[PDB]
C-alpha cells in the first residue's frame, strides 16, 4: 500500500555477476542495518566465475558496495593416504545469503569436491559449501556437511545408500532464532534432498583452515528413504522456520520439495529431529509447488501461517485451455493440536509465463494496521513482461485477495526483477518496514522505502 515507488535506491554490482541473485538485511552489533547481496557469477582470481558477496551500507543514493572477502583458492590436502580436493570454479558463491545476529552466511551450492586414493576416487561432485563471516571482527569459517572420503566403488557395493556427493548444500538456507543454521541440499541422497543443521557457534569453534574434512558433533542431517515418492523430489529446494506445534521451546522446519511424488510437489513441516508433522501436497503436476515458502502470521492471532509458491501453475481458461501464470497458497494455522487444512486462500497470476509466486517475502506490518503483510514476486509478470512485485495486506480472515499495491520493474527486460525479495526490516529508521528487491539479470538491487499512509485500507 504505502511503499514509495517514486524515489528508489539502487545498488549495483559488476556486469555479468548476477548481483542481486540473493540478498538479506544485516544488522551490525550496534543495530545499524546494511544489505548483504550475493552475486554468484562474480569473477574470481583466475578470471573465472566463482561468485562473491557484497555488504552494502545504507545510503538513500545507493551506488557501489564493498566486497565481503572469502578465500577463493582451490585447496588440496594429502592426508591419511588420500588426496582431498575442493574446486571453487563456478561454485556460485552468493547463490544464497542469510544474516543472523552479526554473522553473515553465504553459500556456494555448486562447489565441487573429490577424494583421490591411488587409482580410485570418490568422484568429482557438487557437495556445496557455506562460508560464514563476522564482518566486524574479521572471523571466517566454513561448513560443508556433505564432504566425504568414501571411494566410488564403496557406494556401488552399497547400492548408493546415504550418498551425499551431490548435496549442493546451501542451495537454500535459514537460521533459527537460537542461532542454528539450516541448509537445504536438494541433491542429497542421490537427488532425494536432505537438510543439514548445526549451531553457528559450533561451526565457528570447530573450523580451522586447511583441514577440509572435520567434525561438527552437534550437527544433524536428515534421512535417506526407500519410498519412490521422494525420488528426485529436491527436498530442500527451499527452507524456512516457524512455530507450528504450539510448544515454544521447539522450532519447526518448513521444507519445500517442488518435484516430490513424480513432480506433484510438496511442502513438509517437521520437528527439529526431522520427524514429519504435516505434509501439503501440490495441486498440479510440474507447477513446482514448494519452489518457495514463507512463514508469517498474517491474520493477527499470534499463530504462524504458511505461504507456498507454485510459479508454474497453469490456470484453467475458456475452451479447455490452460495458462501458466503461477499461484500462491495460504494456509492458516488452526488453534491448538490440529492439522493444517485445505488452503484458506488462492492467489493466482495474471500474466502468461510471469511466474507469480517465484518468491514470497513477509513484510511485517507495512501499513501499521495490526496485521502482517506479504509481497509476492512475478519476475516476468506485468503487462510488458519485465517483472512485478505485488503487495497483499493481512486481515482477520487471512489476506486480501487483491493487491494493495503493484511495483513494476524499473529495469529493462530480462532483469528477473523480484527473483529475490526481503522485507520486514526498517532500513532508514522511519518507523516503517521496507522492501529490497533483487534483479540479478540487471546486476542491481532496488530498495523501496515505506512511507506514511496517504489514505488507509
Amino acid at each position, epitope marked *: 500500500l504505502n511503499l514509495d515507488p517514486v524515489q528508489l535506491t539502487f545498488y549495483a554490482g559488476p556486469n555479468g555477476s548476477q548481483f542481486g541473485f540473493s540478498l538479506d538485511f544485516h544488522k551490525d552489533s550496534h543495530g545499524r542495518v546494511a544489505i548483504v547481496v550475493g552475486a554468484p557469477r562474480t569473477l574470481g582470481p583466475s578470471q573465472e566465475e566463482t561468485g562473491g558477496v557484497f555488504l552494502c551500507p545504507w545510503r538513500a543514493e545507493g551506488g557501489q558496495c564493498p566486497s565481503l572477502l572469502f578465500d577463493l583458492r582451490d585447496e588440496t590436502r*594429502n*592426508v*591419511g*593416504s588420500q588426496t582431498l580436493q575442493t574446486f571453487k570454479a563456478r561454485q556460485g558463491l552468493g547463490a544464497s545469503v542469510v544474516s543472523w545476529s552479526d554473522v553473515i552466511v553465504a553459500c556456494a551450492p555448486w562447489q565441487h569436491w573429490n577424494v583421490l586414493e591411488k587409482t580410485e576416487e570418490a568422484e568429482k561432485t557438487p557437495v556445496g559449501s557455506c562460508f560464514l563471516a563476522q564482518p566486524e571482527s574479521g572471523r571466517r569459517a566454513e561448513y560443508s556437511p556433505c564432504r566425504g572420503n568414501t571411494l566410488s566403488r564403496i557406494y556401488v557395493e552399497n547400492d548408493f545408500s546415504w550418498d551425499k556427493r551431490y548435496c549442493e548444500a546451501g542451495f537454500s538456507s535459514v537460521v533459527t532464532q537460537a542461532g542454528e543454521l539450516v541448509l537445504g541440499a536438494p541433491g542429497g541422497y542421490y537427488f532425494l534432498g536432505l537438510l543439514a543443521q548445526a549451531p553457528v557457534a559450533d561451526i565457528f569453534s*570447530s573450523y580451522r583452515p586447511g*583441514i577440509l*574434512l572435520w*567434525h561438527v*558433533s552437534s550437527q544433524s542431517l536428515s534421512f535417506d528413504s526407500s519410498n519412490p515418492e521422494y525420488f528426485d523430489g529436491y527436498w530442500g529446494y527451499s527452507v524456512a522456520v516457524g512455530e507450528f506445534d504450539g510448544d515454544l521451546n521447539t522450532t519447526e522446519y518448513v521444507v519445500g520439495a517442488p518435484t516430490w511424488s513424480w513432480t506433484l510437489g510438496a511442502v513438509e513441516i517437521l520437528d527439529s529431529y526431522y520427524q514429519r508433522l504435516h505434509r501439503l501436497r501440490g495441486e498440479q503436476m510440474a507447477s513446482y509447488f514448494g519452489h518457495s515458502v514463507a512463514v508469517t502470521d498474517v491474520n493477527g492471532d499470534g499463530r504462524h501461517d504458511l505461504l507456498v509458491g507454485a510459479p508454474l501453475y497453469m490456470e484453467s481458461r475458456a475452451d479447455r485451455k490452460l495458462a501458466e501464470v503461477g499461484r500462491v497458497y495460504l494456509f492458516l494455522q488452526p488453534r491448538g493440536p490440529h492439522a493444517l487444512g485445505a488452503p484458506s486462500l488462492l492467489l493466482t497470476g495474471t500474466q502468461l509465463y510471469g511466474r507469480f509466486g517465484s518468491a514470497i517475502a513477509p513484510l511485517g506490518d507495512l501499513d501499521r494496521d495490526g496485521y502482517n503483510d506479504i509481497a509476492v514476486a512475478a519476475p516476468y509478470g506485468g503487462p510488458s513482461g519485465r517483472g512485478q512485485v505485488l503487495v497483499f495486506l493481512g486481515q482477520s480472515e487471512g489476506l486480501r485477495s487483491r493487491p494493495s499495491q503493484v511495483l513494476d520493474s524499473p529495469f529493462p527486460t530480462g532483469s528477473a526483477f523480484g527473483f529475490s525479495l526481503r522485507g520486514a526490516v526498517d532500513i532508514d529508521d522511519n518507523g516503517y518496514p521496507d522492501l529490497i528487491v533483487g534483479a540479478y539479470g540487471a546486476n542491481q538491487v532496488a530498495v523501496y522505502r515505506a512511507q506514511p499512509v496517504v489514505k488507509a485500507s
Partner: antibody, heavy 119, light 108 residues
Framework: EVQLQQSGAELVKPGASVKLSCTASGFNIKDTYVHWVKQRPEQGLEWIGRIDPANGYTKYDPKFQGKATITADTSSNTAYLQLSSLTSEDTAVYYC????????????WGQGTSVTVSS | DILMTQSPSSMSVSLGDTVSITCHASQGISSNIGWLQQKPGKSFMGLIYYGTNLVDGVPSRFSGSGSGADYSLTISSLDSEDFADYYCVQYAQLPYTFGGGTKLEIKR
C-alpha cells in the same frame, strides 16, 4: 563431555584370545573413526588399526594383520579389539583413540587396558 | 612406513623455562602431525593437531610449528604439570607412526 571407557585389565594364557572393549561416553561411537594403539615400555607406541563404526570398514598396520581384529556395535556404543594366538610380545597397554575435529587426527584417548600374557 | 625421529629423548629443565621438542619425518607430511602428552602413570591427552592447532582445553603456553619434514612442540614458561612424556604422531599416510618420545625431567 567426550570420554572413552575401556575394559578392565586382562590376564590370559599364551595361545588364547582376548577381546577388549571401548565404550563411548557423552557421544555416539558412530560419529568418528576409532583407532587402537599399542604401548610397550621398550618398543613404544604402535598403531594397530582403525574402524569406522558407522559401516564397519577397517584399516590395519600389516604388522598386526591376522593378530588383531577390530569391530564395533553402535547399539552398545562400543568398539572392540580382538587379539588371537596371544604371546609374550602381545603383553602391553592398549588404547582406543578418536579425533576431535580433524577427521584423521588422534586427540581423545581412553584410559588404557593392560594385557598380560603368561602361563 | 614413515619414520618419526623425535629428539631429544629426554631433557632436564626447570619451572619457567622455554623448551622445544623437535620431530623429523623420513619424508614430507605437510603439517599432518599431532602432539601428545602422557603424565606419569596416566593416559594420553591431545595437545596439537594439524601442526599448529591447539586441542580444546590446552593452555596457550603450548605451541606447534614447522613444515615439510621438520616440526616442533614448544612450551613457554614450564609449569609443574608440564613434566611428563611427549610424543609426536604423523597421519599423512597409513599406517600412522609415532615418535620415540621425550621425557621432561626436573633439573637439580
Amino acid at each position: 563431555e567426550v570420554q572413552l571407557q575401556q575394559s578392565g585389565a586382562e590376564l590370559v594364557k599364551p595361545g588364547a584370545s582376548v577381546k577388549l572393549s571401548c565404550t563411548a561416553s557423552g557421544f555416539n561411537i558412530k560419529d568418528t573413526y576409532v583407532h587402537w594403539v599399542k604401548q610397550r615400555p621398550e618398543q613404544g607406541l604402535e598403531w594397530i588399526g582403525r574402524i569406522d563404526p558407522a559401516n564397519g570398514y577397517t584399516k590395519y598396520d600389516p604388522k598386526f594383520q591376522g593378530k588383531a581384529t577390530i569391530t564395533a556395535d553402535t547399539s552398545s556404543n562400543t568398539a572392540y579389539l580382538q587379539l588371537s594366538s596371544l604371546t609374550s610380545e602381545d603383553t602391553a597397554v592398549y588404547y582406543c583413540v578418536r579425533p576431535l575435529y580433524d577427521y584423521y587426527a588422534m586427540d581423545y584417548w581412553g584410559q588404557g587396558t593392560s594385557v598380560t600374557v603368561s602361563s | 612406513d614413515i619414520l618419526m625421529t623425535q629428539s631429544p629423548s629426554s631433557m632436564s629443565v626447570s619451572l619457567g623455562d622455554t623448551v622445544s621438542i623437535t620431530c623429523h619425518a623420513s619424508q614430507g607430511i605437510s603439517s599432518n602431525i599431532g602432539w601428545l602428552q602422557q603424565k606419569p602413570g596416566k593416559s594420553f591427552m591431545g595437545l596439537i593437531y594439524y601442526g599448529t592447532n591447539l586441542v580444546d582445553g590446552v593452555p596457550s603456553r603450548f605451541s606447534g610449528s614447522g613444515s615439510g619434514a621438520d616440526y616442533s612442540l614448544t612450551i613457554s614458561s614450564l609449569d609443574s604439570e608440564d613434566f611428563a612424556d611427549y610424543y609426536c604422531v604423523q597421519y599423512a599416510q597409513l599406517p600412522y607412526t609415532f615418535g620415540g618420545g621425550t621425557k621432561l625431567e626436573i633439573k637439580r
